[PDB]
Amino acid sequence: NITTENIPVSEYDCLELEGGGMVVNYTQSDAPEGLEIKTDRNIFEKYEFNVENHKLKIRPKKEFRKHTNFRPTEFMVTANSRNLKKLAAAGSTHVNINSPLQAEEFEAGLAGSGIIQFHDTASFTNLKIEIAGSGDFVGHKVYCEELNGDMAGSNTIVLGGTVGIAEFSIAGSGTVRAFDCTMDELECKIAGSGDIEAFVVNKIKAEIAGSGSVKYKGDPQDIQKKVMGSGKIEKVE
Amino acid sequence: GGDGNITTENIPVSEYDCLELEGGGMVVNYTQSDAPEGLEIKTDRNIFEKYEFNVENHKLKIRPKKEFRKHTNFRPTEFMVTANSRNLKKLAAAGSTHVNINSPLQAEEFEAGLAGSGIIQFHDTASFTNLKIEIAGSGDFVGHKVYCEELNGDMAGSNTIVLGGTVGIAEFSIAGSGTVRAFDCTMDELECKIAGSGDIEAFVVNKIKAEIAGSGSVKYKGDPQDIQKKVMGSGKIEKVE
């Protein structure tokens, strides 16, 4: 039996999601924090939605972790808060940031094959992205002073916008699509057959151990390459 | 970087049971046989002169000389390594490599290591007491005929391990993305620890144990009478017809 419920929540700036087919529609607004859930009775019974230490944790109750095996008809989450500095998602999850996003420091974390996407402008001073698994991150309108990407596995990071200093660490066949992202400086390490595409204005430092590749647009004045293997670091137009 | 001037060099080598290679575009053809150790390099001359092939404490190390470590700057037109020895307990490759074991392989304990990109395949029977496989980066392991008591597969990055044969206890650790195709490998016990994304297929006779932090799928055939799991995220163990 599918039903919609409004869950009371105190102010939170972190969001931890461990779901099964969970679809999260989050927005940042000036209004009071809100949380609405649409799912089966089984999920309401076995899942918890508690806020502690200013972190809204949506995960199965501890006494229903041994069993699991949910597979619900629907699991849509509508949430909103004044601020958001950390986003952690694990398992089958889809996180949609449907509004403009702003924070001094932000950490996006994905473990598994989920998806995190900033549909609108995302503005920060420091943005950290960590992906472990075959998941995806998409942000066509990201603007930050520093961006650190830590990737392990066959995942993708699609970026667009502008970034001052961008560091990427790729372990495996992860892919970074960022030709539409103007980076002042790029520094990266690829261990494997991973692939990076970027627009670099001033400086690029790239290192590849394996057959991966780094392709950069723009005209950096300082270029440092290091390749052990068949990989390549090239300028494209 | 290779000048296209391909040369074929037979390198004198003493007894060795460990083979460690470093480079790019390398094709390694190894065989185990009851004959004197041998080594043959076929590659561009200019690259050849930048490489060393020394045996140190039964470790045959194929890599660039110290004074040329400023980068695998060179890019070979070809680089094939043909080698043979009476025994082999370890084979490690770093960079971009294709390692072919072209004969039956036998050892009490064996370690197959792959860093960077490439593939390691045991084309014929491979028998051990304990087999260890370590893949870091984007590497694959293929061995349709592996027979051992204990197998340990440790994967970091984006990796695949194809297995066939018979194993007593199989242990796999995946960090990042990991895939195991082992329906043709009859395992008494399956143990896996996944951190990221993992997809495991195997024939299990007695037991399955799986810990999943992220996303994971464990598909099995057979009728194991002991199945347990811990999951943080999404994980599922299921039998397939």
The two three-digit tokens of residue B152, written as one number: 């340990």
Closest CA relative to residue A22, chosen from A61, A62, A63, A77? A77
Separation between Cα atoms, residue B20 and residue A64, nearest integer Å: 48
Residues of A with Cβ-Cβ distance to B115 under 8 angstroms: 191, 209-210
Q: In B4-142, where does DSSP find H-type helix? A: 45-48
Separation between Cα atoms, residue B174 and residue B104, nearest integer Å: 28
Among B26, B117, B228, B237, most A C-beta atoms within 10 A, so best to mutate, is B117
* Contact across the interface for B71 and A133, Cβ inside 8 Å: no
Separation between Cα atoms, residue A65 and residue A46, nearest integer Å: 9
What is the distance in angstroms between the Cα of B149 and the nearest Cα belonging to chain A?
Answer: 29
Whether the Cβ atoms of residue B71 and residue A228 lie closer than 8 Å to each other:
yes
Residues of A with Cβ-Cβ distance to B139 under 8 angstroms: 192
Closest CA relative to residue A187, chosen from A140, A226, A129? A226
Whether the Cβ atoms of residue A181 and residue A200 lie closer than 8 Å to each other:
no
Whether the Cβ atoms of residue A96 and residue A78 lie closer than 8 Å to each other:
no
Separation between Cα atoms, residue B124 and residue B126, nearest integer Å: 6
The two three-digit tokens of residue B228, written as one number: 């347990």
Whether the Cβ atoms of residue B95 and residue B72 lie closer than 8 Å to each other:
yes
For A63, residues 6+ apart whose C-beta sits below 8 A from its C-beta are none
Whether the Cβ atoms of residue A194 and residue B138 lie closer than 8 Å to each other:
yes
- Chain B within 8 Å of A65 (Cβ-Cβ)? yes
Whether the Cβ atoms of residue A144 and residue A127 lie closer than 8 Å to each other:
yes
Residue with structure tokens 């999943």?
A: B212
Residues of B with Cβ-Cβ distance to A211 under 8 angstroms: 24, 96, 116-118, 138
Cα-Cα-Cα-Cα dihedral sign, residues B199, A152, B118, B61: negative
Question: What SS3 class is residue A62?
Answer: helix
Whether the Cβ atoms of residue A33 and residue A76 lie closer than 8 Å to each other:
no
Residue with structure tokens 């070809």?
A: B78
Cα-Cα-Cα-Cα dihedral sign, residues A188, A131, A137, A99: negative
For B134, residues 6+ apart whose C-beta sits below 8 A from its C-beta are B111, B112, B113, B114, B154
Closest CA relative to residue A108, chosen from A128, A79, A138? A128
The two three-digit tokens of residue B153, written as one number: 């597969």
Cα-Cα-Cα-Cα dihedral sign, residues B42, B43, B49, B54: negative
- Chain A within 8 Å of B77 (Cβ-Cβ)? no
Closest CA relative to residue B159, chosen from B194, B127, B203, B128? B194
Residues of A with Cβ-Cβ distance to B23 under 8 angstroms: 228-229
* Contact across the interface for B24 and A112, Cβ inside 8 Å: no
Q: What is the CATH number of the domain that holds A45?
A: 2.160.20.120
From first CA to last CA, the distance across chain A in angstroms is: 56
DSSP string, A195-222: EEEEEEEEEEEEEEESS-EEEEES--SE
- Chain B within 8 Å of A20 (Cβ-Cβ)? yes
Q: Which residues pair with B121 in a beta bridge?
A: B100, B142
CB half-sphere exposure, A10, CA atoms < 13 A: 6
What is the distance in angstroms between the Cα of A131 and the nearest Cα belonging to chain B?
Answer: 8
Looking at chain B, which residue has its C-alpha nearest residue A195? B138
The two three-digit tokens of residue B67, written as one number: 């004074």
Structural domain count of chain B: 1
Residues of B with Cβ-Cβ distance to A173 under 8 angstroms: 138, 157-158, 177
* Contact across the interface for A113 and B197, Cβ inside 8 Å: yes
Closest CA relative to residue B217, chosen from B240, B193, B195, B200? B200
From the number of C-beta atoms within 10 Å of its C-beta (0-12, 13-18, 19+), residue B152 rates as middle
C-alpha Rg value of chain A to the nearest Å = 19
The two three-digit tokens of residue A56, written as one number: 């809204």
Which domain range does residue B61 map to?
1-241
Whether the Cβ atoms of residue B93 and residue B118 lie closer than 8 Å to each other:
yes
Question: What SS3 class is residue A53?
Answer: coil
- Chain A within 8 Å of B113 (Cβ-Cβ)? no
Whether the Cβ atoms of residue B109 and residue B91 lie closer than 8 Å to each other:
no
Separation between Cα atoms, residue B187 and residue B147, nearest integer Å: 10
For B84, residues 6+ apart whose C-beta sits below 8 A from its C-beta are B30, B31, B32, B33, B35, B37, B38, B39
The two three-digit tokens of residue A60, written as one number: 């199965």
For B56, residues 6+ apart whose C-beta sits below 8 A from its C-beta are none
DSSP string, A126-146: EEEEEEESS-EEEEEEEEEEE
DSSP string, B134-191: EEEEEEEEEEEEEEEEEEEEEEEEEEEEEEEEEEEEEEEEEEEEEEEEEEEEEEEEEE
Whether the Cβ atoms of residue B51 and residue B65 lie closer than 8 Å to each other:
yes
From the number of C-beta atoms within 10 Å of its C-beta (0-12, 13-18, 19+), residue A235 rates as middle
* Contact across the interface for B96 and A135, Cβ inside 8 Å: no
Among B20, B74, B158, most A C-beta atoms within 10 A, so best to mutate, is B158
Separation between Cα atoms, residue A136 and residue A138, nearest integer Å: 7
Looking at chain B, which residue has its C-alpha nearest residue A111? B214
- Chain B within 8 Å of A100 (Cβ-Cβ)? no
Closest CA relative to residue A79, chosen from A24, A138, A156, A129? A24
Q: In chain B, where does DSSP find H-type helix? A: 45-48
- Chain A within 8 Å of B160 (Cβ-Cβ)? no
Give resolution, Å, one decimal. 2.3
Looking at chain B, which residue has its C-alpha nearest residue A70? B234
Amino acid at A129: I
Residues of B with Cβ-Cβ distance to A205 under 8 angstroms: none
The shares of helix, strand and coil residues in chain B, as percent rounded to the nearest 5, are 5, 75, 20
* Contact across the interface for A194 and B116, Cβ inside 8 Å: no
